[model samples]
Target: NPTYFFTFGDSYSQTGFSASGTQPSASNPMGNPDLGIGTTTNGPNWIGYLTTTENASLVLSYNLAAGGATIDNALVPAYPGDLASQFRLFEDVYADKPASAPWSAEDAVFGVWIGINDIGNAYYSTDAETYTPKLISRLESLVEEVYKNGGRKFLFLNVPPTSRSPLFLEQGEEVVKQHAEYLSVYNENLEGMVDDFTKKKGDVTTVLYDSWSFMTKILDDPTAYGFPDATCINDDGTSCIWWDNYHPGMKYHLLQAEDMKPKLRKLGGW
Candidate 1:
């Protein structure tokens, strides 16, 4: 069966936002230059990243991931078009299918990777965990919505280990590691959450893309993998964090892109 691939998530897929100045685009410069911070300079991003690995011509992959997408942002008032929003948007597209279209419940793959932003905000603000359950519920809802809308395959990527980023490195290496532990626990909970969903919803085919594992594997030993020590996290936290403090350098992105290639190929049928 012919299957179209779709993606929804956050900055991890953002090829637009720059990693620089005051604007969001400035903080993520790797997309259409006119629309981003490094628009003037050299800032081509994941759009190019994926196209390079996955044949840009054959696979019709569309990335609806934004810079700061979250459950609350996608579903409710914070800002429209989170995973759920993108799910609905996909339906809107399918509903407008052309004359001889074969789009159906068995002919499409959906990728949803969220929750990192929710946890990122909590980690940065040091907030409580009241909304964790609600967030997971929203994820389930998103999955169900996609299934109901002709999505046959679901590729779910867990939140990356947030504390390992240079932004959180300011909190101290020990503190950041502690934060990583916290997020690791959350990932464990998320795994259980996905299992629960699978048990209840047998109709949806699912695959787990371990973004957390991919990220931590590299952060633990950058030099070992021939990656540069770019994020600038010292042995301790009481120091300057990073360039902009959140997004890593192109070095890290290239490593992540390289590692994720096999997983993406397997999940998206590339």
Candidate 2:
């Protein structure tokens, strides 16, 4: 059934004040068009759309993700660290310190989007060996931790094709392809771990949102997806399609939402 939409992770899951710390580049989209470039606040977002359509039957949704967060940004920047920084709000509410408010477990379906920065910094870090498994373990642990915290239903999306971003463009085709291969491996592990977790607990529902397929489809054949220009790919600098080296235009979130709504309605039991 339709329920509340509670989100965590980085910029992709954002709906409000949560913003990516990094600025958009030539290759990346400007981000949050609804909020606009100079705007500081926003109302409707990808997740917001879901709640609006299902408002009569569903509680409202809220996103607690911030910009520039990794799966473990709370730890050292050069390594996979704890995600506590991303969950600062969770701690406040869960601890019930203020006494004015406490969030219930039934409040919403959890939405999570992280791991990009993990791979981003890792790929750029000195200890790049075994980077794939490190990222995989981080995700696997996150799912377990969230379930332990009483989250049942989930919409877990894999990271996009990072090699296709502007940051990887300077490295050129050979290097980007290698990173894409690594990212593919990461997404595959994500699918397996999520499926396995769902099977084990049964109570904590899990659903895979295929951001990889959506991105691959566009990257492989742009015109097929109705993008503005097939060749207008952005790898670096400031551009329309991408916000920077690793992020995408906020408009793609609409596309992501469109792709996710049907699945959300189905798995969400709406």
Candidate 3:
């Protein structure tokens, strides 16, 4: 049996799967920009791994993640696209289950990994205190919106430790610590929303991957994951953990997919 993976997120989660682009087929699971294209990773992201080698069955992925995406453009504007736009893309093309992207509720899993941009853009200002909560509320609303549109299985990835990135590292120890605290608060709010969402809809299956601790565990010991150091940022996925300052390399995304595989199985997805 095949499964459908409808995903949304920002740069860390995108794979350039546009509805109007070269679509995914069995031979090439991630279509459009190709496996490594439109990604900062220089190779496939976790979504690519999940759709290809990681799953137990064929996973047809409809990835709407865009680079520099925030949860909502209204709250914390990114470039042209945001999670709101991503949802609209899904609703316009895939939600009705067109033959091009046929899926059943039991065999589908809607996944989201967002909020890094929101946290990064606002945490330094009072906007962090004001807008962060609304971001979570938009997250909640989006999930509920997906639920209304025949989503049952869901996979939610919390924001990773963005403060650990070299970009923040250059900002100094104090900045890193402050951003770290804010990132965790975002995760906590996300978890709370997940708990309430699951409870409110008894039929829904949800898994909120603790990306914070997962990435932090690796950062604590970079060599274990084949990185020379936690702070090394390079486009080479073979030696470094990050492709750029903010985004992990494809190899890291590979490890991410490995950790996410069992959780996807729990959602009846893998």
Candidate 4:
């Protein structure tokens, strides 16, 4: 059976998808503006790779990700929009499985890859400590909200090592160290949130793809992954690993999709 993939996230994952624009079919998998239209990777992002190349079966993709999104804008401010608006769009457009899409509970999977901007925008803020906990809590509630809406399968990608990105690195030692510490804590709490959610919900299945671990390995050995070194963050999409200081190039996303296939299999969707 073909699985329906519902995605939510920021620039690293967005593809400028619009439900009313165009519907996905075998002829055109990424059925909106284009493959890399709203991407920061200078090519198809991870979502595009998963939908077009690495998928185990024919997948219908309904992407609701924007360039800069937090789980909730109230908890953390975002640029284009927030996850709240994304979910609302899902509800309004595809929740009841309108004739256009017609997805079943078992055949649909919700994938969320947020928090880069959530932490990036607010990491150095004064009230980070107070809001961070609430942020994760809000994530829990939001994913649970999906569960209530006939979602039986889920994929949650935790934050990767943006602390080690050129953006953070340029700031010097203490800055990099501070960001990494916050990342560690956020990742830890995210793991617990996913674990507890799965344990409590007997009928649902969830997979938390550890982008942190996978990306960390690549970052430590850039040449191993065909990168010159770990510290290039210019706008060069061809030679550099990073497309910019804040975003990794298309190669990273392609690798992510390939590596994530196994976990997607474990989730029984791939």
Candidate 5:
């Protein structure tokens, strides 16, 4: 069957879209015609590869991710877009489409890969303790709205190990430790929250993609994955892991999609 892929998140997933008129299709797929819709990486990001290459069916993707989005607007500012605003936009844009339209909840899956910006900005904040729970609560609320909007299958990409990224490594050990510790707590809470969501929402299927472990595994043994030993900002990103500072190159995106295919099939029952 054909499928429609709906994506929501931050710069890591954004492909640059404007309500003015940019529409992504099989031909002009990336939506950001100028390549100006900057996807934080040197090439196509994970969502790009997943919808185009790893996908098993014909897919129509609506990537609504922006540059700096957070779960709780109060904790960290959502400069471009936030989960709530994104959800509302989704509702406004697709809520009244006719049955003749090319999509429906039955043939659609939602991909949500957020929380990185939220945790990243909040780790050093004095309100870190007060903000964590609020973040989780907002996430849970987002999931509920997605479910209510007829979303059954979901792909949740967890926060990756940014501490190992080149940018953090250059920041010093203490900064690295702080990021790692905060991410640990956020991912833990996220996994537990998803588990509980499944238990409560019997019909909805959610898969948590362990981005932390996935990136860590590659960093731990880069040779096994044909990755470089160090993070360098090479002109041709094919050999380096960090495209520049915080993003992964296209090669890593491809590898991530390849590794995630089987798991997505298993958990999503595709």
Candidate 6:
């Protein structure tokens, strides 16, 4: 059975899927500058690697993720592909699917890896306590929409440890600490939401990818994942974990895809 992978998130997951019929080239499918298409990484991000290289069976991925998307209209407004708008597009496209080429709940996996920029932009706000719940609610609504549309398997990746990123590490210790604390709370809420959503839906299979742990492991021992401890931003991202202060490089993206293969197999049964 083939799995039609539908991804929704921010830059971490965007593959530059254009509705204007722009095709992916051998050199630049997802269209990054030096990285070339579908990713902000030095090379192909997780979605690109998975669809192009990993999956055991045929996997068709439709990535509607934008560079700076939030769950809803939060502190950062997703100019083009917010979660709501993405879901709407999915619905519209799904309706247009030809009957001859059929798909069902069992033949699809919804992958969502958002909320990093949402918290990054809003954590300093005094109303984090009030805003967090609203964010969670919006996420839940998106999940419900997918469920209602015959999606049963879901892969939810929690936020990575941005506090340890070069962007925050270069900041004062207090600033990094505060951001880490805020992210912890958000991840906790997301975990609980997954549990509640699974129980409510009863028949759906939900898997939360521990991206925080995955990233932390690599950061603690970059060599273990075939990376140098310090990022080499000056050159092409061959041995670098980070391409810049915020996004990861090709090596990290490759490791991420490799690390996620087992989980993908478990959920997809492929």
* Top-lDDT candidate index: 3
Clashes of 4: 0
Evaluated against the true structure, the overall lDDT of model 6 is 0.76
Query: Clashes in model 5: which pairs?
Result: none
Candidate 2, which segments miss by more than 4 Å at Cα? 15-45, 53-59, 74-82, 94-107, 124-129, 230-240, 266-270
For candidate 1, what's the RMSD?
A: 7.4
TM-score per candidate, chains pooled: 0.72, 0.73, 0.96, 0.95, 0.89, 0.88
lDDT tens digits by residue: candidate 5, 1-270: 556677899887887766445565556544444432357666777777777777776565678888878875765775747877888887878644434225656777888998888877878773444566678778888877868777778888999987878878998999999988888888888888888888888887679999889888888988788875856665355687777777777778778888888878743323
Instruction: State the local distance difference test value for candidate 1.
Output: 0.56
Steric clash pairs (candidate 6): 30-37, 30-38, 31-37, 31-38, 32-36, 32-37
Model 4: residue 203 alpha-carbon error in angstroms: 0.9
In candidate 5, position 41 carries an lDDT of: 66
What is the RMSD, in Å, between candidate 6 and the native fold over all Cα?
3.3
Give one digit per residue, the lDDT tens place, for model 4 in 1-270. 667889988888888888789887766777786877778888888888888788878887889988889889888886646887888888888888877778877888899998888888877773445666788898888877678788889899999999888888989988887777777777888888888888898887889999999999998998988888887865656477789988998888888889998889855556
Model 6 spans > 4 angstroms off? 22-36, 74-78, 95-101, 127-129, 230-235
| Shift of residue 143 alpha carbon in model 5, Å | 1.9
lDDT for position 174 in model 5: 98
Which tens-of-lDDT digit does each residue in 109-182 have in candidate 6? 88899889888888788465667777988889878887877788999999999888888888888998999888
Model 3: CA > 4 A from native: 127-130
The lDDT of each candidate is: 0.56, 0.57, 0.84, 0.83, 0.75, 0.76
Whose TM-score is higher: candidate 2's or candidate 6's?
Answer: 6
Error of 6 at 169 (Å): 1.9
**Lowest lDDT 10-mer window, candidate 2?**
22-31
Give the lDDT of residue 67 in candidate 4: 85
Using TM-score as the yardstick, the better of models 3 and 5 is 3
